[PDB]
Design a protein around this ligand. Structure first.
Ligand SMILES: [Mg+2]
Ligand SMILES: [Zn+2]
Ligand SMILES: [Zn+2]
Ligand SMILES: [Zn+2]
Lengths: 90, 81, 97
């Protein structure tokens, strides 16, 4: 269910374009990380996609969420089973 | 179905503090626990589970407008925010 | 509107986070929280319930000094972080007595 490159980019555009609007602006202003609920400086939060871009995931308010480096990273490498033990360890 | 884990999160701590800060994911505004609902970012229909990641606070407007406005009409609600 | 980016190195952030740790242990600080007054809401709390807050955040250039350091209660300390400048004002302006 992988997508093409002119798509994996076709969205990473709607990303930077969303990443630059009131919604995302204030969102990072607050500093609250979606996953662990902790507060961080607006810079230490990343735009993370629930359903990946390379799986048909769109870049919208209904699929993109603020995440800190920490949570956002573990999400990438931890195993789908490990990701839970981590969020459930918080 | 997963409506089990569903009402579960609602009684959890991550969600208590969540609906206490009162931030709606969609419009970024703050509301009272009475105006906030729990919504699944990744619809449950398409096989979305009920877990910290795929569940966010949403005021009635955003929750209903997304759950009822056509694909083209929901996108318009946001552009107006 | 002209604008510029100001950067705060991680060397500077630690530097301030250390002076803070030292400032937090001073007789001077112990005295300040001993009074138990929250700088933001002016409500009274037990010394355990107060934390040190920088009016001007360290990542925004602020320093760890008596002037920029202030005692704050749990609620005020966070709300000052996740509420935008306007929700904060209203939050303050909505404290009775
Ligand atoms: Mg902040
Ligand atoms: Zn996090
Ligand atoms: Zn809303
Ligand atoms: Zn206070």
């Amino acid at each position: 269910v992988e997508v093409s490159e002119q798509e994996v980019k076709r969205e990473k555009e709607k990303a930077r374009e969303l990443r630059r609007s009131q919604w995302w602006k204030n969102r990072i202003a607050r500093g609250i990380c979606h996953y662990c609920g902790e507060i961080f400086p607006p810079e230490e939060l990343t735009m993370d996609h629930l359903v990946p871009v390379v799986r048909g995931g769109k870049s919208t308010r209904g699929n993109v969420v603020p995440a800190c480096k920490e949570c956002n990273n573990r999400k990438k490498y931890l195993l789908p089973v490990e990701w839970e033990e981590y969020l459930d360890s918080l």
